[PDB]
Structures are given as C-alpha cells and as structure tokens.
Amino acid sequence: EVVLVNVTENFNMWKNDMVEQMHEDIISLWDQSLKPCVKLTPLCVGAGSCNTSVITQACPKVSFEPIPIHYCAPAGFAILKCNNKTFNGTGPCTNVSTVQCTHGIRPVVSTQLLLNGSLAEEEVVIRSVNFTDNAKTIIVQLNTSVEINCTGAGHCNIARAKWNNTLKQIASKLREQFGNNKTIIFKQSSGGDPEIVTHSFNCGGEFFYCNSTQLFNSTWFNGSDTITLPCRIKQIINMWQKVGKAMYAPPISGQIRCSSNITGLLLTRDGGNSNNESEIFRPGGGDMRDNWRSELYKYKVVKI
Amino acid sequence: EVQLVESGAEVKKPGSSVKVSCKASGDTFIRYSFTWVRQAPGQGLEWMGRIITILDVAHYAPHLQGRVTITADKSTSTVYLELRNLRSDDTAVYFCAGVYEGEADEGEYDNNGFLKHWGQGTLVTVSSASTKGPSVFPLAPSSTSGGTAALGCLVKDYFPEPVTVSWNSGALTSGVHTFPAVLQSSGLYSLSSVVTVPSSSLGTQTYICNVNHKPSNTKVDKKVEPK
Amino acid sequence: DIVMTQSPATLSVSPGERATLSCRASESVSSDLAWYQQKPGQAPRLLIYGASTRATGVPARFSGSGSGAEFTLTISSLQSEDFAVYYCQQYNNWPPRYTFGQGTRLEIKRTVAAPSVFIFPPSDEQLKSGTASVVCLLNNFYPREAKVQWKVDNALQSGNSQESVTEQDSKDSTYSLSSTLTLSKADYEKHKVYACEVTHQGLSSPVTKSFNRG
Amino acid sequence: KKVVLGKKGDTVELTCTASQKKSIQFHWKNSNQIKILGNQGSFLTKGPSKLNDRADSRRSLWDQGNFPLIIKNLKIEDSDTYICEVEDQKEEVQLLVFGLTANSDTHLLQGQSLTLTLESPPGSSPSVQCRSPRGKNIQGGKTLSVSQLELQDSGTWTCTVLQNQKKVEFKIDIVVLAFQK
Ligand SMILES: *[C@@H]1O[C@H](CO)[C@@H](O)[C@H](O)[C@H]1NC(C)=O
Ligand SMILES: *[C@@H]1O[C@H](CO)[C@@H](O)[C@H](O)[C@H]1NC(C)=O
Ligand SMILES: *[C@@H]1O[C@H](CO)[C@@H](O)[C@H](O)[C@H]1NC(C)=O
Ligand SMILES: *[C@@H]1O[C@H](CO)[C@@H](O)[C@H](O)[C@H]1NC(C)=O
Ligand SMILES: *[C@@H]1O[C@H](CO)[C@@H](O)[C@H](O)[C@H]1NC(C)=O
Ligand SMILES: *[C@@H]1O[C@H](CO)[C@@H](O)[C@H](O)[C@H]1NC(C)=O
Ligand SMILES: *[C@@H]1O[C@H](CO)[C@@H](O)[C@H](O)[C@H]1NC(C)=O
Ligand SMILES: *[C@@H]1O[C@H](CO)[C@@H](O)[C@H](O)[C@H]1NC(C)=O
Ligand SMILES: *[C@@H]1O[C@H](CO)[C@@H](O)[C@H](O)[C@H]1NC(C)=O
Ligand SMILES: *[C@@H]1O[C@H](CO)[C@@H](O)[C@H](O)[C@H]1NC(C)=O
Ligand SMILES: *[C@@H]1O[C@H](CO)[C@@H](O)[C@H](O)[C@H]1NC(C)=O
Ligand SMILES: *[C@@H]1O[C@H](CO)[C@@H](O)[C@H](O)[C@H]1NC(C)=O
Ligand SMILES: *[C@@H]1O[C@H](CO)[C@@H](O)[C@H](O)[C@H]1NC(C)=O
Numbered sequence: 001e002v003v004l005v006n007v008t009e010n011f012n013m014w015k016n017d018m019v020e021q022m023h024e025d026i027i028s029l030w031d032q033s034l035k036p037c038v039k040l041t042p043l044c045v046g047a048g049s050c051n052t053s054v055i056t057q058a059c060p061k062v063s064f065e066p067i068p069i070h071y072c073a074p075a076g077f078a079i080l081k082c083n084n085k086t087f088n089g090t091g092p093c094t095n096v097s098t099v100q101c102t103h104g105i106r107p108v109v110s111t112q113l114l115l116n117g118s119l120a121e122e123e124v125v126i127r128s129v130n131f132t133d134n135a136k137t138i139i140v141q142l143n144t145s146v147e148i149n150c151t152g153a154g155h156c157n158i159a160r161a162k163w164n165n166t167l168k169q170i171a172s173k174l175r176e177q178f179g180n181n182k183t184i185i186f187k188q189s190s191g192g193d194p195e196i197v198t199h200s201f202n203c204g205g206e207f208f209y210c211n212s213t214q215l216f217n218s219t220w221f222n223g224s225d226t227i228t229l230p231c232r233i234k235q236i237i238n239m240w241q242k243v244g245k246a247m248y249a250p251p252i253s254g255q256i257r258c259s260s261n262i263t264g265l266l267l268t269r270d271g272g273n274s275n276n277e278s279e280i281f282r283p284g285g286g287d288m289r290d291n292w293r294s295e296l297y298k299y300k301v302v303k304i
Numbered sequence: 305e306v307q308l309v310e311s312g313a314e315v316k317k318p319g320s321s322v323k324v325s326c327k328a329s330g331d332t333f334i335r336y337s338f339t340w341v342r343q344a345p346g347q348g349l350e351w352m353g354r355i356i357t358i359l360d361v362a363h364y365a366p367h368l369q370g371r372v373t374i375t376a377d378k379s380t381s382t383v384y385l386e387l388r389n390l391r392s393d394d395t396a397v398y399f400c401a402g403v404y405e406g407e408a409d410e411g412e413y414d415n416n417g418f419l420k421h422w423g424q425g426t427l428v429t430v431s432s433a434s435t436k437g438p439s440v441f442p443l444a445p446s447s448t449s450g451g452t453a454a455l456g457c458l459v460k461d462y463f464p465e466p467v468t469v470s471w472n473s474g475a476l477t478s479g480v481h482t483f484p485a486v487l488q489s490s491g492l493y494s495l496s497s498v499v500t501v502p503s504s505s506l507g508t509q510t511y512i513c514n515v516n517h518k519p520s521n522t523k524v525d526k527k528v529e530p531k
Numbered sequence: 532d533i534v535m536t537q538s539p540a541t542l543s544v545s546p547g548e549r550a551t552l553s554c555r556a557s558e559s560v561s562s563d564l565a566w567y568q569q570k571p572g573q574a575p576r577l578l579i580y581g582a583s584t585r586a587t588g589v590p591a592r593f594s595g596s597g598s599g600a601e602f603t604l605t606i607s608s609l610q611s612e613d614f615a616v617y618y619c620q621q622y623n624n625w626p627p628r629y630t631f632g633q634g635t636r637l638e639i640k641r642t643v644a645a646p647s648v649f650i651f652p653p654s655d656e657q658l659k660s661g662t663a664s665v666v667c668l669l670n671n672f673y674p675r676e677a678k679v680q681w682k683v684d685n686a687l688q689s690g691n692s693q694e695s696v697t698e699q700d701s702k703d704s705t706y707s708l709s710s711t712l713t714l715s716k717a718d719y720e721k722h723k724v725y726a727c728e729v730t731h732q733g734l735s736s737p738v739t740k741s742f743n744r745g
Numbered sequence: 746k747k748v749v750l751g752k753k754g755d756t757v758e759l760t761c762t763a764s765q766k767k768s769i770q771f772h773w774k775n776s777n778q779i780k781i782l783g784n785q786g787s788f789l790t791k792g793p794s795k796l797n798d799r800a801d802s803r804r805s806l807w808d809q810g811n812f813p814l815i816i817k818n819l820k821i822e823d824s825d826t827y828i829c830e831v832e833d834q835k836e837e838v839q840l841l842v843f844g845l846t847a848n849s850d851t852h853l854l855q856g857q858s859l860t861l862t863l864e865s866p867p868g869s870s871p872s873v874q875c876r877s878p879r880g881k882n883i884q885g886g887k888t889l890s891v892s893q894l895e896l897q898d899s900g901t902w903t904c905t906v907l908q909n910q911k912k913v914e915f916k917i918d919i920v921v922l923a924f925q926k
Contacts, residue, residue, distance in 0.1 A: 037625055134778065190790075273779075443666060452647075486693045488713075500670060
C-alpha cells in the first residue's frame with residue numbers, strides 16, 4: 001500500500017507469528033474439509049500405558065482444491081512488507097512498505113517440491129536459518145516455474161530440459177553459499193517416512209506419493225524428452241498436522257489429473273566431517289511451516 | 305491366499321464369557337482384514353464385527369456393541385473373538401472370515417467388506433445344562449409292511465451337541481437317515497437314526513447302532529432286534 | 532439399519548435348468564453387494580462381490596447383476612453341486628454395519644413321492660426308566676411339506692411332540708421326517724390306541740398308522 | 746558425558762528429553778556430524794549414516810517431549826558418541842557395543858577347554874568376569890579361557906562386562922556331556 005521513506009526494519013522469517021497463525025488455519029481447514037474414514041493419534045501421557053485415540057467417521061470423497069488466502073492485519077497490529085526483490089528473509093530491510101493484506105497465498109500441502117507459489121523476481125534465492133547446520137532445511141525459490149503433470153494412473157511428468165536448467169541454477173546458488181570450488185551433488189532422500197521420502201501432495205482429493213530419485217541424481221561443476229516419475233496413491237497416510245495416521249477411501253474417479261507449477265524446493269545438505277570438496281543435497285520437507293515460510297518470508301506483523 | 309483354522313467347540317453357562325481363536329496361515333497377515341460371522345442353528349448368517357488388522361482397529365454390529373471384542377496377534381497371525389455376558393441365544397456356530405485388502409504395508413487399502421476366506425467354524429453352546437451322555441433305545445421293526453422293514457435307535461437326553469451315529473460299525477450306510485437333533489423342553493437334545501432294510505433280512509442279519517458322544521466320552525452300541 | 536430381504540424363501544428347480552434368486556435392500560447399497568453359497572455343515576463360500584464380479588474358482592454359470600437396492604443371482608444351468616442355501620450381503624455403510632439377507636434355499640424339484648409311514652411304540656427299557664417316546668417315521672417323500680398329527684384314543688394331541696427333517700437326499704432327492712410324541716409312563720398307561728396321521732400331496736387320503744398299547 | 750553399553754545384536758534406546766511436553770524439532774547426529782535421524786514436523790527423517798536401516802524413534806512419545814534414538818541389531822562399529830540437538834541444546838551420549846562368544850557352538854566333553862572372546866570397539870578397555878552354573882569364576886580382558894570343564898559346568902554361564910563404571914550382562918549356554926564309565 002504505502003512505502004515508508006528512510007525506514008529500516010529487521011525481519012526474521014524463521015521467527016514469524018504469521019507462519020504459526022497460517023499453520024493453525026490450514027490444520028483447521030483440513031479437519032473441516034477432508035475427513036478420514038479412520039483417524040489414529042497416540043496418547044502416552046500415562047505411566048507405561050499407551051492409549052491410541054481412534055476416531056471412525058463418515059468419509060465422503062471430496063475434490064480438494066486450494067483457494068488463495070489473504071492475511072490482513074490482526075486487531076491492534078500492522079503488516080510490514082520488505083520490498084527488496086532479493087531479500088534473504090533474515091536481517092535489515094531498507095525498503096519497507098505497510099500493506100493492508102498479504103498477497104493471495106494458496107495453502108498447498110506438499111513435501112520436497114513447493115507448488116503453485118510465488119517466484120523470485122530476479123535470480124534464484126536460497127534461504128536457511130543456519131546454512132552451516134546440516135540439519136536445517138534449505139528453502140529454494142525459483143525464478144522460473146517448472147510444470148509437473150500428475151495422473152491417478154500412477155505417474156508425474158516433468159520436462160527434462162527445463163528441470164536440468166533448474167538444477168544448474170540451484171547448484172550455482174549453492175556454490176555461491178558453500179564454496180566456489182565445491183562440486184554440487186543431488187541425491188535421493190536418505191530415508192524416513194514415505195511422505196518425506198517421496199514428493200507427496202494431494203490431487204483431486206487423493207494422496208500421491210511420487211518417487212523423486214530421477215529429479216535428484218546429478219553432479220554439478222565437477223536422456224529422454226520427459227522425466228516420468230512413478231507414483232502411488234495411498235489410502236493409509238501419516239498425518240502432517242500432528243503425530244498420527246489416517247485412512248481414506250479408495251478413489252472413485254478413473255480420471256485424476258492435475259498440473260502444478262514447481263516454484264520452489266525444500267532441501268537438506270548432507271554435511272558431516274568431510275575434507276571432500278563436494279556438497280550433497282537431498283529433497284526434504286515435512287514441516288508445513290516451511291511451506292508457509294516460503295510465501296510469508298517478506299512480511300511481518302508489528303503492534304501499532 | 306490364507307487358510308483359517310479355528311479353535312475347538314465351547315460349552316458355556318449363560319453369563320460366562322468365551323474367547324475363540326482363528327489362526328491365519330499362508331499369506332501376509334497384515335494385508336488382510338478379518339471378520340466374525342455367526343449362525344444360530346436353523347438360522348442365517350449374522351455379521352458381528354471386523355478388524356482392520358494393520359491398524360488394530362475393530363468395528364462391531366450395534367446389537368453387540370459393548371460386549372464383543374475382536375483382536376489380532378500379529379506375532380502369531382491369530383485373530384480373536386471375545387463375547388461377554390453370554391446368553392442362551394448366543395448359541396451358534398462362529399465363523400472367522402477374511403479378505404485381502406491390498407499392499408497394506410505400503411498404505412494401499414481397499415477396505416473390502418466381502419469375505420473370501422472362511423474358517424471351519426466353532427460351535428459355541430450356551431446353556432444351563434450340564435454335560436451328559438445319551439440314553440439309547442431301540443426302535444424295533446414290526447410286522448413295517450412290504451418287502452422293506454424300518455428300524456432304528458432313539459438317542460435321547462444328551463448335552464451338548466454333537467452326537468455321531470453309525471450302523472454295524474460303518475458297514476451299513478445305504479438307507480440310513482440320522483435326523484438332526486431337536487432341543488427338548490428339558491434343555492437336553494434328542495435324535496433318531498433309522499434305516500430301511502429288506503424284511504427277509506430280519507432274523508438273519510444283526511443290526512447294531514453305534515452312538516458316540518465325545519463331550520461326555522460316551523460310546524454306546526445298541527442291538528436292534530425284531531421284538 | 533440396512534435390511535436385506537431375499538426371495539423366494541425356497542426355490543425348487545429341476546436339474547439342468549435356470550435359477551434366479553432375488554436380493555432387495557431397504558435403501559441403496561450401490562454395488563457393495565456379495566453372494567454366498569452354503570451347504571449343510573460347511574462354511575459359506577463367496578460367489579460374487581461388487582454385485583457382478585465372480586470370485587476365483589467360481590464357474591461362469593454363476594452371474595450377478597443389479598445395483599442400488601435390487602440384485603439378482605442367476606445360475607444358468609443347475610448342477611448337482613449347486614443345490615444349497617444362498618445369502619446376499621450388503622457392505623456399503625461406514626461406519627460398517629454390514630448385514631445379510633435371510634437366505635434362499637435352492638432345492639431339487641422332482642416328481643411327487645408319497646411317504647412310507649412307520650410307527651414305533653416305546654421300548655420296554657425306556658418304559659422302565661419312567662417315560663414313553665412314540666416315534667412316527669415318514670420315509671422318502673417329496674415335496675418337503677407334510678402334516679403329521681397325533682391322536683391318542685381319537686383325541687387330537689398338541690404341544691407334546693417334536694418334528695425333525697433330513698436334508699434332501701443326494702441320491703433320490705427325497706426328504707424324511709420324524710415326529711416324536713413324548714409322555715410320562717403314567718400318562719402313557721392311561722390310554723390305549725396311539726396313532727399318527729399323515730397328510731401329504733402324494734397321498735389321496737390321510738395315512739394312519741397305529742398300535743394298541745400292550 | 747553419559748555412557749551407555751549395548752550388546753551386539755540387541756536393541757538400545759538412547760534418550761533425549763526436552764524441557765516441555767510438546768513435540769518440537771530434534772535431530773540426532775554422530776561425533777562426525779553425520780545425521781542419524783530427526784523429525785520434520787510430525788514425520789521422521791533418516792540421514793545418510795551406516796545406522797540408517799536399523800535406526801528408529803518412538804513417535805508416540807514426541808508429544809511428551811521425548812525423542813529417543815533406538816538402534817536395533819547393534820554392531821560393534823555402532824560405538825560412537827551421539828548428540829541430540831533439541832531446543833538449541835545438546836545432549837551427548839557415548840555408546841559402547843560389546844559381543845561375547847564361546848569358542849564352539851558344539852557340545853563339549855568333560856576335561857575340554859572353553860574360551861570366551863569379547864568383541865569390543867577401539868578405544869575401550871573393559872573388564873570381564875564370567876561365572877558357570879557350578880560357581881566357577883574366570884576373569885580377564887579380551888579373552889577368558891577355562892582349562893578344563895567339569896560336568897557341573899554344563900548350563901548357562903553369566904558374564905559381566907565392566908566399562909566406564911557401567912556393566913552389561915551376557916548369558917551363554919554351554920553343553921558339557923555326561924558319560925558312563
Ligand atoms: C530521507 O532520506 C533522504 C535521502 O537520503 C533525505 O533527503 C532526507 O533528509 C531523509 N529524511 C526523510 C525521512 O525524509
Ligand atoms: C483409554 O481411554 C479409555 C476411555 O477414555 C479409558 O477408560 C482408559 O482408562 C484408557 N486406558 C487404556 C489404555 O485403556
Ligand atoms: C536485498 O536483500 C539482499 C539479501 O538479504 C541483500 O544482500 C541486499 O543488500 C538487499 N538490497 C539492498 C538494496 O539493500
Ligand atoms: C541476509 O541479508 C542481510 C541483508 O539484508 C545480511 O545482513 C545478512 O547477513 C544475510 N544473511 C545471510 C546468511 O546471508
Ligand atoms: C523501494 O521499493 C519500491 C517498490 O515497492 C520501489 O518502487 C523503489 O524503487 C524502492 N525505493 C527506492 C527509491 O530505493
Ligand atoms: C533466474 O535466475 C538465474 C540466476 O540464479 C539467472 O541466471 C536467470 O537468468 C534468471 N531467469 C530469469 C527468467 O530471469
Ligand atoms: C549454526 O550451525 C552450526 C553447525 O551445527 C552450529 O555450530 C552453530 O552454533 C549454529 N549457529 C547458531 C547461531 O546457532
Ligand atoms: C503438462 O500439462 C500442460 C497442460 O496442462 C502442458 O502444457 C505441458 O506441456 C505438460 N508438461 C509436461 C508433460 O511436462
Ligand atoms: C542438462 O541436461 C541435458 C539433458 O537434457 C544434458 O545434455 C546436459 O548434460 C545438462 N547440461 C549441463 C550439464 O549444463
Ligand atoms: C525410486 O526409484 C529408484 C530407482 O528405481 C529406487 O532405487 C528407489 O528405491 C525408489 N524409491 C522409493 C521411495 O521407492
Ligand atoms: C543416476 O543418474 C545417472 C545419470 O545421471 C544414471 O545413469 C543412474 O542410473 C542413476 N541412478 C539411480 C540410482 O537412479
Ligand atoms: C496448482 O494449480 C493448478 C491450477 O490452478 C491446480 O489445478 C492444481 O491442482 C494445483 N496443484 C496443487 C498441488 O494444489
Ligand atoms: C504454470 O506457469 C506457466 C507459465 O507461467 C503458465 O503458462 C501455466 O498456466 C501455469 N500452470 C499452472 C498449473 O499454474
């Protein structure tokens with residue numbers, strides 16, 4: 001709305017109450033909208049005796065389709081916006097505006113790849129709360145989107161040339177952060193729950209789990225026209241909202257199709273004590289707050 | 305596919321509880337859901353409940369809700385049905401049954417409600433009656449007109465089911481009718497076994513009925529004679 | 532509560548001919564409908580699921596059809612091993628409260644056969660035990676429907692007899708039936724003539740068999 | 746400087762507790778900063794370590810602020826220092842894995858020898874004491890040898906390994922044959 005002249009404000013995307021708020025909002029949205037046939041959550045508050053909470057309910061098939069959300073100022077507060085096109089999300093911003101609301105954010109729940117979000121306006125950007133810490137997630141923001149087309153028939157397609165150009169841009173940014181003489185290597189997820197080992201997302205109300213090995217298997221600064229990822233629709237899933245499991249009914253549509261734009265990634269670096277002149281990066285995610293951070297990094301709420 | 309083998313027959317007083325088991329062999333246990341179905345004598349099938357084995361979650365028929373429990377032991381591939389506060393009308397054959405659900409260990413689950421595999425059944429008798437062997441009485445042939453004569457054994461006042469009857473130690477089967485038992489007002493069972501034989505064969509051929517009642521370890525052989 | 536109703540209760544079909552069994556639901560169950568076959572003393576056997584899909588090992592002469600609230604099981608040519616009881620099962624609801632129809636008994640239609648009737652007085656041994664069982668046997672008849680009445684000294688008896696009936700015979704397709712009259716020894720010796728009267732389609736007139744006590 | 750002893754082939758649980766009863770971000774690493782295992786929100790992640798397929802946590806405890814590192818089918822080479830990072834703090838635990846085996850798995854004769862060999866990680870120096878059914882006591886370092894078995898030695902031997910003030914117990918079944926003279 002209105003640019004603040006000569007004002008310098010500190011931002012910290014990793015400690016932003018707007019993220020926590022959006023997170024609780026999306027959890028509520030899912031509870032009301034997407035009801036599982038069976039829902040299981042742990043409860044081991046007792047002494048050496050666990051009590052799994054089990055909910056069984058009607059579970060209608062519903063075509064899920066994220067709708068943009070705009071966050072406006074909560075009572076007694078104002079929203080500030082960093083106008084710096086290459087802002088890393090953590091530090092002083094010399095070009096600050098006050099806005100009535102954020103842009104429209106689509107609350108896509110996914111791992112590994114960020115879909116249908118905002119692109120960087122200039123060059124590719126990478127963000128982390130601590131790059132030196134191999135355990136902290138690296139959020140990647142693309143400046144050019146890449147199409148991914150998925151079908152309930154069991155696969156997702158991605159143009160190989162476009163993806164290859166994307167990896168090169170990312171690796172160049174990773175070199176610039178970790179070392180100009182380092183080889184940048186992408187590898188598949190090293191393990192964990194199926195939801196984070198695969199690129200997982202929801203399409204047509206169904207839960208997809210796509211093998212992303214072919215997307216993350218290259219060496220930088222040391223095929224076919226289209227990359228086809230094998231996928232699987234699951235009925236029994238681990239919940240992202242909290243620790244638990246949910247069961248959904250099988251699909252009722254023989255034509256489940258969606259195309260999304262990859263606009264970002266979630267990565268982690270292997271690290272470890274290695275005198276080797278290379279860094280290894282694998283797809284990550286799982287904490288959906290990182291998904292919300294990828295959109296909200298440029299906003300903060302301040303009390304009037 | 306999976307083979308289901310159930311535990312042996314049970315005899316219970318009203319008010320007791322019972323726990324029947326069913327061993328599943330031959331396939332991946334957690335890829336199946338299991339269901340219990342019962343059938344009272346002379347009546348139809350009744351769905352009792354079903355366990356989603358991979359999740360350890362069971363659902364029950366409303367009229368049973370509260371006094372039935374279905375569990376599964378993944379380490380022994382065994383399914384259990386517990387029925388509490390037994391009533392005489394709980395007397396039935398209890399069947400364990402199952403169906404393949406998909407690659408459950410990989411999150412695939414059809415939630416199939418039909419039943420492909422069935423156990424052999426478990427008779428559960430609930431009654432105030434105490435175990436007792438049958439009295440066996442002859443049904444002697446008479447003057448049974450024609451060239452054919454009828455004779456038999458009356459097998460009376462035993463509990464519980466079943467009783468097994470043969471003739472001439474299994475050498476005689478042609479023309480035998482062993483009737484289904486009836487429950488008498490005394491709470492004890494009764495049945496007849498008859499056989500039609502040439503009337504010219506009376507006086508020359510001996511007819512003995514062999515009655516076995518396993519529950520009371522009783523075995524009776526009764527010669528049935530003309531007069 | 533989804534109620535499943537089957538018709539008819541009994542279906543009589545000549546060997547080698549077509550059989551059509553009906554299943555109705557009290558509300559729609561879509562296509563979540565299964566058919567089972569059950570022979571006496573055995574577990575049920577799955578024939579059809581999803582309303583129309585044959586289970587493995589099920590011959591092509593079995594076919595299911597229908598959707599919503601009305602379903603049909605057709606057996607195009609009855610073999611000896613197809614005579615049994617058939618049940619439908621609904622599994623559409625969630626939370627699950629699956630229910631079965633009460634069954635249709637499919638039996639062999641043969642020509643009428645009158646029963647051979649035999650009567651057995653109580654044995655001396657049972658009489659010594661203090662009770663008297665009189666047994667009336669109706670042997671090898673068709674159809675299954677038969678009426679048996681006990682008369683003691685011309686007095687029509689009620690409430691003191693029990694009937695049992697065999698499964699249809701695998702060789703001649705007939706049934707047999709027993710009716711057992713029970714009285715105390717004291718009541719038994721209070722009367723003279725004991726008669727069972729049999730009514731059946733195969734008999735022009737009721738058949739009476741009797742004996743005089745003593 | 747918490748020390749935990751494990752047995753080769755067994756399962757060990759290393760504990761990590763947060764200051765509050767809530768599921769928060771945690772990660773376990775080894776002394777070379779290799780990621781073993783952690784969470785991402787409500788999901789488990791596993792790192793590129795040699796423990797990968799034998800490492801797990803107990804997610805039903807996360808909501809209570811407990812984030813254990815559970816390692817099954819323990820190997821001697823699993824011996825390392827493991828660090829749990831949670832609430833910007835670090836819990837350090839040293840794991841030592843030991844194995845103890847008899848010289849043969851076949852039945853022994855009276856008068857024959859029995860030798861037990863302790864398999865141990867580099868840098869450790871344990872004390873071993875073992876006791877037979879009859880009360881025969883033998884002590885040593887890496888290798889413990891009884892010269893002559895008695896018939897009364899047949900049965901379960903109990904051997905205690907002492908390391909860093911801590912001890913772990915091994916039970917080994919030995920068969921000594923009787924004979925008619
Ligand atoms: C703001 O900066 C401009 C340019 O440096 C300067 O002319 C002016 O004095 C400053 N004060 C404000 C906030 O107007
Ligand atoms: C589990 O919850 C039930 C119902 O609230 C409660 O009665 C019971 O004590 C709890 N404990 C277990 C493990 O059964
Ligand atoms: C924009 O933000 C980037 C990254 O935080 C920073 O390096 C740069 O100095 C900023 N640009 C300006 C004009 O200050
Ligand atoms: C992020 O950008 C700011 C400038 O706005 C800079 O001060 C800070 O050091 C940057 N952080 C990193 C890790 O590059
Ligand atoms: C601050 O950012 C705005 C975009 O909102 C841009 O128009 C302007 O050039 C920036 N301010 C200056 C003059 O540096
Ligand atoms: C995207 O950024 C990269 C540098 O990271 C740059 O080379 C490329 O030209 C940019 N693409 C567009 C569309 O501006
Ligand atoms: C960044 O991560 C490194 C590596 O784990 C750690 O040593 C350092 O303390 C971290 N920095 C901050 C500010 O926490
Ligand atoms: C994805 O589908 C879109 C049409 O919605 C198409 O334009 C694009 O070429 C497809 N991309 C692939 C198959 O990589
Ligand atoms: C990008 O991928 C192409 C195949 O699409 C391959 O030929 C080439 O090695 C890559 N380009 C580089 C390494 O710059
Ligand atoms: C993905 O595919 C690769 C190559 O076929 C395979 O090695 C890997 O295990 C797969 N990953 C998953 C998640 O199944
Ligand atoms: C990794 O990629 C190379 C070429 O980029 C390919 O030849 C190889 O099969 C891939 N390996 C896996 C694990 O998919
Ligand atoms: C991305 O947006 C497209 C078009 O608006 C939509 O069809 C698709 O479902 C979205 N993808 C996801 C994963 O929400
Ligand atoms: C993805 O972005 C491209 C180019 O901006 C656009 O043409 C296409 O409609 C977008 N597709 C989706 C699914 O949003």
